Design an enzyme around this catalytic site. Structure first.
Site, PDB file in Angstrom:
ATOM      1  N   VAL F  49      -3.569   5.965   3.431  1.00 47.37           N
ATOM      2  CA  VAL F  49      -3.492   4.602   3.677  1.00 47.37           C
ATOM      3  C   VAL F  49      -2.171   4.010   3.541  1.00 47.37           C
ATOM      4  O   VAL F  49      -1.692   4.119   2.656  1.00 47.37           O
ATOM      5  CB  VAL F  49      -4.991   4.070   3.032  1.00 47.37           C
ATOM      6  N   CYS F  50      -1.484   3.872   4.390  1.00 44.64           N
ATOM      7  CA  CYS F  50      -0.619   2.295   4.530  1.00 44.64           C
ATOM      8  C   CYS F  50      -0.545   1.459   3.353  1.00 44.64           C
ATOM      9  O   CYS F  50      -1.833   0.439   3.543  1.00 44.64           O
ATOM     10  CB  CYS F  50      -0.672   1.561   5.827  1.00 44.64           C
ATOM     11  N   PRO F  51       0.596   1.194   2.296  1.00 40.02           N
ATOM     12  CA  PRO F  51       0.960   0.303   1.579  1.00 40.02           C
ATOM     13  C   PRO F  51       0.616  -1.233   1.966  1.00 40.02           C
ATOM     14  O   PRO F  51       1.645  -2.251   1.249  1.00 40.02           O
ATOM     15  CB  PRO F  51       1.490   0.262   0.511  1.00 40.02           C
TER      16      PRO F  51
END
Lengths: 168, 161, 171, 167, 169, 170, 167, 171, 163, 177
Positions: F49-51
């Site tokens: 997942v993208c931070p």
């Protein structure tokens, strides 16, 4: 508390009138005899044993009413037999014909609620009917008497009532 | 286990006195002063006749002479007791007796003295308590066989001598 | 929790019938079949008027027309009940009433109905039980103020009415 | 064990006063001061029976003469009590009653008085409390059959009589 | 331990439908069928604007468009909810709202969703529950602040998107 | 046991990576009487997942300083993993040189105490807002990695701060 | 009491394989079939150079010769492990090791092995498990001290010699 | 939980010194003064030859250079220890070793250090304790394989070096 | 409560037999068949002369003629026992005795017979078990004072003669 | 569970029949610092088997006085039974007028504490030597009518009292037997 209810069971070693040793069960009497179980503290005491011998003088009165008389203390059968072989002069009970029970473990006295100080019993009379039900309890803390006449009457009265109920 | 030879369990109860007055009684008013004969019986107004209570009352002077207080106890209310004293013998009452009757309305006394049967009513019993508050004698009957007044006076006397 | 609106605690007790004989009454002998008005009073033979219990015996037919059984109850023995009945009213007894008196000798009925006082005696109380054995009404008095047989009857009627039609007071 | 003939269980509740404002009332306020007649009813805003509470208010004077505080109590909040008073008689409200309404929002009071049915709502009940805070009379109804202000006044008078001339 | 990302605690409640009739709502009746947006609020008839509820109802089309059942809930009786619907906005009521309101009269729904305050009333809260009966989103506010209806929609959209496409960027 | 949302935020103490990249220690009680705390949780560093949420919060850091709120990030990873994630360029899926602090809930106990631990492993995504008296005013918990824009966080904080000082308005 | 000389406590864990995929490893899958050398270490990405893991990996063929499965384990998640495989040797990483790394995310493997420290991270340890599932050798270091791979290979040979011949 | 990285469990045992006399050793007497290398071995007079205790005693000066007190421990009594020392190696004895042997007659030391096997005898074990009484290294072996004194010396160096410098990056 | 007059507590132990091999001995192999004399002493290899063990060994035929198995027991390992047998008398040893020595390595036998002192070593004791497994005689000495082997044979005879 | 041998003797207090036939109290504490105690137990008074032990021991009272040992015998019988046993002449199966004191273990409490109670009934035949620091040095328990000679017991006290001073004595010629 066990009064009007079943007599707690006991099995014990005994000295019979002919002076032999044996065993007595409460249950060998159910449906056949009434039992008068009496307790006294100790053999060879300085209270003289008038009660025990008075009860033996009246042994036949007891058989007339179909009752087995049993005495009981925490002394061993051997002390019981030695007490019998002791002259009345010397404080002995002489050669009585009823059986004496040895409560050597003290559990019978525990079971009947008559043990004092985890040591010896108090004086007591228990009347057990033919169904093993306790009809009468007497517990004395003191070295006083109990008339054998008083006991006979009680037996007659309970046997009378047990069969006719209670009017007057 | 047994309280015989030990301290009589404390009790406190409403009571009907000999003169039909209502009051209160508790064990500790007798300690150091009087011997106590406490007897129990199942019920007032029953079809078993109350010969024992009548026999005991007859001998009340004998008891007073030995410094003993005679107490009858049952599970009925103080009002039942009075009612029963108002009923003559012919009608199955006890009539106007002179010793005091305790009301064990809560059943605590019968429980404490181990004479309560089937959680309803007590058995017939006599408990002799001495001037120190020790139980010296206990008799429990399952049937209405009664107890000779002399059997009792003789116990009291053997204890006092 | 309260048993009101829920099932009457079960009871079984020795009883003194209207004809002065001894028997036994229990709650489940009525469930198919009738309403029970159980009432409780402290003691037989007191200095207070048995006026409530005599008033209630007088209207015993009014209760039968409505298909209720009237049971009376205290912690006295059946013997005490009979003896109160064999006592003339002038000497403070109830005389020869026609409805049953229960004996709560063990106290467990008064206890189950939450009307036992000081472990001793019951309070003055009325309990009306359904034909399904559901408690619909409970009244507890601490003192001897009596209760009009007329209100008992109205309450009874209102309950029989409400179980068939609207549960609607007014007024 | 019932509390009848013993000390009434303590409560402390938020309430709606006659003037329509908010406050607290607690049982302790009344001891050695006045009799309390506390009634329970199940729910505000039903059409079953709001006439019982308006009728009890209609009779409030009779209560002050006997020196009895009248307090109603249900499980609804104080806000719901307020709204119910603010609702016209014809839509089923109770109007500007002058007696006080306790809010038993936590169901605490009803549990303590043994009048809570199914952890939901109280049954209909009347509790008469002494000047010494001893419950002298308890009535519990499972159904809405109502109760006349006359039957209630009868009891209170009988109880206040018996307390002087202990018959 | 939280129920978020596990199965919604069961509830069964008496309810006031948009048409003002009484009934029951049951959590499981939506399983397989629709998304549930359950929201809690302290009380009917307070002095706080019911603006959140009115806003919510205004967007009822957008919830149906996303196959979500909007359920309101407090500790008040259903009688109180009906009365609150029959009271004009001007008088502190909610008027005739189209979505259903649940009554938590035992308080056990609030208790089960961990939103009961002091044995009394619920806090303000939003619970979003799956077609599978899994809670995907919980919000609890202690204070009477709003929750933007756009924010609620954007969130529901995101969950529906994730359920189809997984985590994108 | 009911929610803590009415009441005091459960105490925590954790090892941490500061904005400067040094290691330290943060206690909740160092803030009571002086700052608002926005404590957010997320499951893990270095996931797929993208931070983006972490990045977005760090751009708005001045906006938080202006409302006297301390931004605090938190997961179950070690401070070392946090540092290694900051050292990872955004291009390679990292968070870069963010300036707010990150706590290591290495024992999992901050997560347990705040009821956001999932299967004794990792926490859920969550936002808790603690006021200056140490009382929790706001709790948000997501099971999925959906965003949550700072505009919306800022709006909530303002509305809380407004309610605390000036009455309570419509 | 120690598990040494007894059955190795069971464990299952998510794993990162040499090809860099996530999977699952059971202790139960090695019983009867291979020896397992399980080794623990506190943390990925610390300032201690992971030369022990790197040296262990270079010897992978030595371990396969003696029929032993090499398993590393720490309390970091499987995402941290892979990130660390994706970090070059020159940056403090471990690169593409071929043996499998277990993720003790719940920490219970460390607990069951009695190598958990302060409820946080595991100490450094090696546990040799034989084909019957019996632990023959345990080594625990509190400090970042190495262990020669040759020392380890000698221990394994010695243990296997004793299994075929004796003391 | 393990004692590694924490304080060595306290022990207080009877002992056979190099100078063949009896006394007591007590863990606290080394706190602040020496490092302790405690080793455990199953039994005296066994059929496995004692090359390990020999090899360790041969290297005794190496342990003195690093300030480490060598201690051997077994569940045998002090008398079996002495008898073993007075048995020549040609007959399976250990000779007059200069390092001290402890007796864990009650088995409590072995239990405390988690090296008792089946409530009988201890496993082969090595425990390195800090000058602050912190345990830094534990090794346990189920089998009579050796452990060279070189490996052990190297471990003690590394530990002593680590206390002065951190980790050494290349290896 | 003692086990004197009741059945003997069960035991099994590795042992050193007269021919110096190792094996196992347990109480059930004697029951219904042999009398057992189990003796306990603190330790092998002490400064106390093992005069009692030697006196007992010397009388081993006397024991066998009465149908009694002689068993010796201390808390030492079987290995220490063998080493003690290989140490001659002259150098503090017991030499090649013929009766068997049990190893109470776990101290269970000592605990179960109630002769364990300070969780370490057993006391000096003698326990004579019937051929029905019933304990008839128990002696426990705190001090190394010795017991006549004639007293022992005399006890055994009394028991085997008057019931 | 564990043995009291080599430890402090379990405390006791018991009613007693003295030599002069009066009744009394004996507790273990009154001997600490002053005398050694030989406590022996036996099952029952008035049994069919000859009380030779008790009679032999009393014949040797002077040997015990010499060794500074208080001889105390003890059974589960009451003091009244012990007194009767003494007032019964030997011809009549009694023990006669012995001089050492006999304890009454009427509650069985002492037999229980010393571990010699058989079947919650009677004690076994047992001898317990207590030194004057009150430590038990020697315990013998027999199940049957087997009974120590008085010569054996005297010897054992001698060996124990010598051992207290001189420790272990390696016997001359021990290698022989």
């Amino acid at each position: 508390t066990y009064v009007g209810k079943e007599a707690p069971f006991f099995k014990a070693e005994a000295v019979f009138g002919d002076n032999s040793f044996g065993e007595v069960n409460l249950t060998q009497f159910i449906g056949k005899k009434y039992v008068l179980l009496y307790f006294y503290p100790l053999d060879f005491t300085f209270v003289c044993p008038s009660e025990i011998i008075a009860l033996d003088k009246a042994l036949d009165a007891f058989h007339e009413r179909n009752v087995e008389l049993l005495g009981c203390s925490v002394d061993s059968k051997y002390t019981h037999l030695a007490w019998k072989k002791t002259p009345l002069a010397k404080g002995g009970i002489g050669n009585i014909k009823h059986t004496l029970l040895s409560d050597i473990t003290k559990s019978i006295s525990k079971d009947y609620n008559v043990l004092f100080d985890d040591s010896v019993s108090l004086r007591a009379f228990v009347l057990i009917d033919m169904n093993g039900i306790v009809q009468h309890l007497l517990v004395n803390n003191l070295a006083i008497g109990r008339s054998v006449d008083e006991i006979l009457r009680i037996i007659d009265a309970i046997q009378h009532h047990e069969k006719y109920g209670d009017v007057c």
